[PDB]
């Protein structure tokens, strides 16, 4: 089917420039324009601009002088570049495609790229087990999890047993600590009788720091 | 630029009820309005185009109407999968603009939390920091109190809470309260207790451990 | 309300 896959999230220093790649499939950039939309806390959804089938670009007015969109039809890539970012340029950036070649009803979206504008440094998390016990087992159900501590910036992805375990998973919103680093926990409830039979692994991935950790979580 | 005003900011309904979202435009935009759904951690999903026209793959319970300045997206029988924010978009005038969204929350029966406490791991203790985690799982409604006591001393200012968005299947929330202290402070004390207060509990629930046993 | 970058949801 139609798909748009964006490059990974990450940090950009203030007054520096942002670059995202959108790789499309299931259609040809020669037949459809690709639009760029961002979503921020301050301004919500903003349409930024578009590159059309034949290479022309339109940019939303407040961005004409710091926005550049280019593409490579053969490689099915669209390249978004935006100059001199400030803190309020922190947002989820998306590429999108309309239903028809000339229109703006966005039926296909990329997965979004969270861009953080900040002067700080990237830092991978430490992953610590939240071990099941009796103080976490009632009625035959055990709770267990992973503490994903001290990383920057957002986001971090957490899955369980390489994607095979989804039922009963809660991955909490990250909270910013006084250190300026994020921390979160991811929990799952499972039958306590399965704790000696099944392995439970939280797969943690902090793409901004290329930190991938698999943490086995065992009864203590 | 056309300004789009969505109202109210929050809607709260019970499953099976009908719900309407309003999107008003600063001047007439004909029927050039598109609606989107955003679920937790999602990108927008196109629900309706041009005020009333269906989109392939979208459940028939979604519909929209309106023309001129006053537009309405409707769900004729809400389901828990519909927990999301809803946005309108105008494209009668360049540049295309979006409204600020309406949040759709679901009501359900009271569900008391299951409470679990997790001591700090020996791994984390090697780093000189101790995190104590108190989990409140699968409850409704959102309001809850977590009180930390270390050796009967009330703990204040040294814990942080996080609440999930509403579950798309059972409409519950879960909450984590993390008490953080230095390894030195953690080693100088014995009884770690979080106390949980919730409408669904007939008295507070205390989970505790002694550092060690 | 206000958009939350962590959850992609409005926080009111």
Residue numbers in the entry:
A (entry chain B): 1 to 220
B (entry chain A): 1 to 213
C (entry chain E): 1 to 12
Question: How does the study describe this entry?
Answer:
Recently, a unique binding site for a cyclic 12-residue peptide was discovered within a cavity formed by the light and heavy chains of the cetuximab Fab domain. Here, multiple crystal structures of meditope peptides incorporating different cyclization strategies bound to the central cavity of the cetuximab Fab domain are presented. Collectively, the structural and kinetic data presented here indicate that small perturbations introduced by different cyclization strategies can significantly affect the affinity of the meditope–Fab complex.
Overall, it was observed that the disulfide bond used to cyclize the peptide favorably packs against a hydrophobic ‘pocket’ and that amidation and acetylation of the original disulfide meditope increased the overall affinity ∼2.3-fold.
